[PDB]
Structures are given as C-alpha cells and as structure tokens.
Write an enzyme that holds these catalytic residues in place. Structure first.
Site, PDB file in Angstrom:
ATOM      1  N   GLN B  26       0.769  -1.237   0.000  1.00 30.65           N
ATOM      2  CA  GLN B  26       0.000   0.000   0.000  1.00 30.65           C
ATOM      3  C   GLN B  26       0.789   1.269   0.000  1.00 30.65           C
ATOM      4  O   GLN B  26       1.947   1.299   0.426  1.00 30.65           O
ATOM      5  CB  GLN B  26      -0.894   0.049   1.259  1.00 30.65           C
ATOM      6  CG  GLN B  26      -0.067  -0.152   2.546  1.00 30.65           C
ATOM      7  CD  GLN B  26      -0.815   0.015   3.860  1.00 30.65           C
ATOM      8  OE1 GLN B  26      -0.504   0.914   4.637  1.00 30.65           O
ATOM      9  NE2 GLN B  26      -1.778  -0.861   4.133  1.00 30.65           N
ATOM     10  N   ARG B  30      -3.521  11.054   2.799  1.00 32.57           N
ATOM     11  CA  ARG B  30      -4.648  11.593   3.567  1.00 32.57           C
ATOM     12  C   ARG B  30      -5.572  12.346   2.598  1.00 32.57           C
ATOM     13  O   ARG B  30      -5.096  13.098   1.720  1.00 32.57           O
ATOM     14  CB  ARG B  30      -4.136  12.539   4.642  1.00 32.57           C
ATOM     15  CG  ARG B  30      -3.271  11.834   5.698  1.00 32.57           C
ATOM     16  CD  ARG B  30      -2.745  12.871   6.672  1.00 32.57           C
ATOM     17  NE  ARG B  30      -1.935  12.256   7.734  1.00 32.57           N
ATOM     18  CZ  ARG B  30      -0.639  11.949   7.617  1.00 32.57           C
ATOM     19  NH1 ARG B  30       0.009  12.171   6.461  1.00 32.57           N
ATOM     20  NH2 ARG B  30       0.056  11.534   8.694  1.00 32.57           N
ATOM     21  N   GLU B  92      -4.257   3.374   0.055  1.00 37.05           N
ATOM     22  CA  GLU B  92      -4.964   3.550   1.313  1.00 37.05           C
ATOM     23  C   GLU B  92      -5.258   5.045   1.451  1.00 37.05           C
ATOM     24  O   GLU B  92      -4.326   5.869   1.503  1.00 37.05           O
ATOM     25  CB  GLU B  92      -4.094   3.103   2.489  1.00 37.05           C
ATOM     26  CG  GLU B  92      -4.772   3.324   3.835  1.00 37.05           C
ATOM     27  CD  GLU B  92      -3.834   3.079   4.977  1.00 37.05           C
ATOM     28  OE1 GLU B  92      -2.814   2.411   4.761  1.00 37.05           O
ATOM     29  OE2 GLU B  92      -4.107   3.558   6.096  1.00 37.05           O
ATOM     30  N   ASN B  96      -9.667  11.823   7.915  1.00 36.44           N
ATOM     31  CA  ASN B  96      -9.790  12.245   9.301  1.00 36.44           C
ATOM     32  C   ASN B  96     -11.071  13.046   9.322  1.00 36.44           C
ATOM     33  O   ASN B  96     -11.146  14.114   8.724  1.00 36.44           O
ATOM     34  CB  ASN B  96      -8.565  13.080   9.726  1.00 36.44           C
ATOM     35  CG  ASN B  96      -7.319  12.227   9.799  1.00 36.44           C
ATOM     36  OD1 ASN B  96      -7.348  11.149  10.385  1.00 36.44           O
ATOM     37  ND2 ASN B  96      -6.230  12.674   9.180  1.00 36.44           N
ATOM     38  N   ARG B 115       9.362  19.563   0.130  1.00 40.59           N
ATOM     39  CA  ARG B 115       9.126  18.420  -0.742  1.00 40.59           C
ATOM     40  C   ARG B 115       9.475  17.082  -0.110  1.00 40.59           C
ATOM     41  O   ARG B 115      10.322  16.990   0.771  1.00 40.59           O
ATOM     42  CB  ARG B 115       9.945  18.587  -2.032  1.00 40.59           C
ATOM     43  CG  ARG B 115       9.464  19.715  -2.920  1.00 40.59           C
ATOM     44  CD  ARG B 115      10.375  19.881  -4.154  1.00 40.59           C
ATOM     45  NE  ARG B 115       9.687  20.734  -5.120  1.00 40.59           N
ATOM     46  CZ  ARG B 115      10.034  21.977  -5.435  1.00 40.59           C
ATOM     47  NH1 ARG B 115      11.101  22.541  -4.881  1.00 40.59           N
ATOM     48  NH2 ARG B 115       9.267  22.680  -6.266  1.00 40.59           N
ATOM     49  N   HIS B 119       4.489  11.449  -6.209  1.00 37.10           N
ATOM     50  CA  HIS B 119       3.266  11.081  -6.949  1.00 37.10           C
ATOM     51  C   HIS B 119       3.087   9.586  -6.982  1.00 37.10           C
ATOM     52  O   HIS B 119       3.981   8.873  -6.582  1.00 37.10           O
ATOM     53  CB  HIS B 119       3.399  11.545  -8.441  1.00 37.10           C
ATOM     54  CG  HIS B 119       4.644  11.060  -9.151  1.00 37.10           C
ATOM     55  ND1 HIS B 119       5.789  11.826  -9.281  1.00 37.10           N
ATOM     56  CD2 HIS B 119       4.913   9.886  -9.777  1.00 37.10           C
ATOM     57  CE1 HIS B 119       6.704  11.146  -9.957  1.00 37.10           C
ATOM     58  NE2 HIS B 119       6.194   9.963 -10.266  1.00 37.10           N
ATOM     59  N   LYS B 149       9.407  18.643 -22.953  1.00 37.47           N
ATOM     60  CA  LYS B 149      10.263  17.730 -23.674  1.00 37.47           C
ATOM     61  C   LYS B 149       9.953  16.264 -23.421  1.00 37.47           C
ATOM     62  O   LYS B 149      10.254  15.414 -24.267  1.00 37.47           O
ATOM     63  CB  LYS B 149      11.735  18.007 -23.347  1.00 37.47           C
ATOM     64  CG  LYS B 149      12.669  17.361 -24.360  1.00 37.47           C
ATOM     65  CD  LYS B 149      14.106  17.374 -23.925  1.00 37.47           C
ATOM     66  CE  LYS B 149      14.832  16.222 -24.583  1.00 37.47           C
ATOM     67  NZ  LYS B 149      14.596  16.279 -26.029  1.00 37.47           N
ATOM     68  N   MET B 150       9.347  15.966 -22.271  1.00 44.01           N
ATOM     69  CA  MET B 150       9.002  14.588 -21.917  1.00 44.01           C
ATOM     70  C   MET B 150       7.636  14.299 -22.536  1.00 44.01           C
ATOM     71  O   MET B 150       6.644  14.292 -21.832  1.00 44.01           O
ATOM     72  CB  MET B 150       8.886  14.449 -20.401  1.00 44.01           C
ATOM     73  CG  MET B 150      10.078  14.936 -19.604  1.00 44.01           C
ATOM     74  SD  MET B 150      11.397  13.728 -19.544  1.00 44.01           S
ATOM     75  CE  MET B 150      12.333  14.164 -20.977  1.00 44.01           C
ATOM     76  N   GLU B 165       0.943  10.277 -12.126  1.00 42.60           N
ATOM     77  CA  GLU B 165       1.594  10.119 -13.427  1.00 42.60           C
ATOM     78  C   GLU B 165       0.798   9.143 -14.296  1.00 42.60           C
ATOM     79  O   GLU B 165       0.236   8.168 -13.794  1.00 42.60           O
ATOM     80  CB  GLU B 165       2.999   9.572 -13.215  1.00 42.60           C
ATOM     81  CG  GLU B 165       3.844   9.539 -14.458  1.00 42.60           C
ATOM     82  CD  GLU B 165       5.246   9.106 -14.154  1.00 42.60           C
ATOM     83  OE1 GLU B 165       5.775   9.552 -13.137  1.00 42.60           O
ATOM     84  OE2 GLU B 165       5.841   8.326 -14.914  1.00 42.60           O
TER      85      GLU B 165
END
Ligand SMILES: COC(=O)c1c(C)cc(Oc2cc(C)cc(O)c2O)cc1O
Ligand SMILES: COC(=O)c1c(C)cc(Oc2cc(C)cc(O)c2O)cc1O
Ligand SMILES: [Zn+2]
Ligand SMILES: [Zn+2]
Lengths: 180, 176
Positions: B26, B30, B92, B96, B115, B119, B149-150, B165
C-alpha cells in the site's frame, strides 16, 4: 443543526463508487515516487533490510537527477538490454520510484519531508509480511529506526519503521489485521 | 554529479531469504473528502474500493482501493480483510473526520516546499486516449502529455491535489 462529522457510512461510501469504464481495464498502479537524499543509504536499506530489488537506474544528466526503481521482483527476470529493461520495469506493478536530485547527499542543510508533520499529506508505504514479530526482531537486530514497535501503543500487531529519509513504512500481516 | 552505476549497484544487497514473500502492499494518502476521492479513483481512474475500515475512537476512516475485480472480493469481513491486505499495489486513503467541512484545510501534495513524496503513477496502454477522456471528464492537469520535452507522459491531480503520473511502459524508452 448540521451534525458533527462521523465520516461516511459503508453504504454511502460504496454508493459513491462507480464500476470501471471499459477503457481503464488494463490500467495498473505502477509506482509510488519518493525523493531521497542519498541513494547509497536508500539502496542499502531497501535491498538489504527490506529485500527489494533494484530494477533499473535511470540518469537524466540534462536535468541533474536519477531515478531508482525498486520492487519485489526476481533479479533474474530483469531483461539485460536497456530498451527491454525499460519496458519491463515500467510495466511491473507496485514499484517504488526513488528520485535523486544530484548533490543533496552532500548538502548538510538539505532534507526531505515525510508528510507526517505540518504540512501533512502523504503518510506511508506498507509492506505485507508473514510475521510482523519475526520481521521486526530482525529489523531491531539490524539497527532499523522504529516509529511504532509492534506491541507498543495502538494497533498491537502492526508496526511502523522508517527509511533513511524518514519516510514511514508500515509492516503488517494481512491475516491478522481483522483481529486488530 | 550523480552516482556511477558501479557505486549504486555496490550498495545493493541480494534479498535475505526471510524477506522472500514480502510484498509492497500500500501507499497511504490523507484525503479531505471521501465522497470526491472515491468518485475520482473509481469512476475516473477505474480502481475498485476493496474495503472500508472505521476507527470511531480516533475519528478516522480508511479506504482501500486497487485495480481488482469486485467479484473477487470475499464477502465475509475477516476473509475480506485478509484478502485486501494481501493485494499488491493498493492505495490507502485516510479520512480524518471533519476535514470535508473545513474550508481552510487542504493536504500538502509534496511537490512544493517542503518536498518529499512526489506522486503515484498508473501504467496505461495509450496515454493520449486516457488523457483525452480525463480532459473530457474535467480532470485537472499538472502536465499534459504533449507538453514539454518529456512527450507522452502526463501528470494529473486527484481531488486533494496529489499528482498522478500517466505513462505508457512501451513508449517510455523514447524519453529516457
Ligand atoms: C496513534 O495512531 C496509530 O498508531 C495509527 C493510526 C493513526 C492509523 C493507523 O492506520 C492503519 C490501521 C490499520 C489497521 C491498517 C493500516 O494500513 C493503517 O494505515 C494505524 C495506527 O497504528
Ligand atoms: C521537466 O520536468 C518534468 O516534466 C519531469 C521530471 C523533472 C521528472 C520526471 O520523472 C520521471 C521520468 C520518467 C521517464 C518516468 C517517471 O516515472 C518519472 O517520475 C518526469 C517529468 O515529466
Ligand atoms: Zn514517476
Ligand atoms: Zn496503512
């Protein structure tokens, strides 16, 4: 008066679920990406402590980062040819994409955030094992840092450890979750 | 500079036999509103809600979703639980209670300072048809597949802003 939230009833929750559109029939949850400060520590932890296998290391010199894909796979199933290796790696279910932005391992002021303290978001990844107790006894012997030992606190029988960057990893036995 | 292949490979130990049946079960995120999240992950992305667990004493609920056939889910609670927790690649979602009524609350997706997590990613047979459908369904994008470019790789967002992604394993090699 608006009732205090008690979350959703099971009925309401399933009432919000739609069956999959035929166009998504072949979709698969391929990766979870985490940024890591030092691949030397992370690779040692995920392979030696957790038993995953490095499927592929991808370097992007123009962007100064590398990706390390780890997964529970037999090293002998990894194709040798770079092109063949790439298509296989990205069609494996349940991989971990560890992103290494070059230079962070030598920047003493840098560190990533694990999502469990302000500002919260992501929580943890989790590994199913046959025996949480024997697994954790071995993690203890190997010096693994624990967030929650199996018999400590709430949810006895369930444990949480952390990787080199501090990301939390749940250790659970699927057949004992039902009895809390 | 990054690690050389030698340096990276040298840090990889073969798996200890005691870890042989371990599986990556998993990823937990949240979520602010389960009604929105469940609609997104099932109707838009095609996952199936396997099981819901509530913990009233701690005021939160857990939702386990995965790409599984709902007809395979066991009916009895304890058998259902063991099955859900033994599936690879589940998501998962932790709710809350109360966050759905707080206009000043939102979770942090990990892609702005500070950071950490980045993702989850879904492998699909055609990134362009998948994203055309996502666009038509009102999904928000971080990166359309033809942008940058990707090319042929996209990033969309779920109701909480988490990045997802969308990739085609067979076309990935062209942008590595
Ligand atoms: C003090 O809080 C906890 O210990 C705790 C919390 C807050 C949540 C929690 O969630 C899960 C419970 C279960 C039973 C399974 C999971 O995969 C979970 O992520 C498990 C926990 O042990
Ligand atoms: C120019 O920045 C990007 O768009 C970008 C960056 C910076 C990284 C990136 O990483 C991946 C590359 C590939 C080829 C596969 C993945 O799963 C990735 O997470 C993918 C991207 O599209
Ligand atoms: Zn990715
Ligand atoms: Zn969990």
């Amino acid at each position: 008066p608006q009732p205090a939230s008690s979350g959703l009833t099971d009925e309401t929750a399933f009432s919000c679920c739609s069956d999959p559109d035929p166009s998504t029939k072949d979709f698969l949850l391929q990766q979870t990406m985490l940024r890591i400060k030092d691949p030397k520590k992370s690779l040692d932890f995920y392979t030696r402590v957790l038993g995953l296998t490095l499927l592929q290391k991808l370097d992007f010199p123009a962007m100064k980062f590398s990706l390390y894909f780890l997964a529970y796979e037999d090293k002998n199933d990894i194709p040798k040819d770079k092109s063949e290796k790439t298509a296989w790696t990205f069609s494996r279910k349940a991989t971990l994409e560890l992103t290494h932005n070059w230079g962070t391992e030598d920047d003493e002021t840098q560190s990533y955030h694990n999502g469990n303290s302000d500002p919260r978001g992501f929580g943890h990844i989790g590994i199913a094992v046959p025996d949480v107790y024997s697994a954790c006894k071995r993690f203890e012997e190997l010096g693994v840092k624990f967030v929650k030992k199996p018999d400590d606190g709430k949810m006895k029988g369930l444990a949480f450890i952390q990787d080199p960057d501090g990301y939390w990893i749940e250790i659970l036995n699927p057949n004992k979750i039902a009895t809390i």
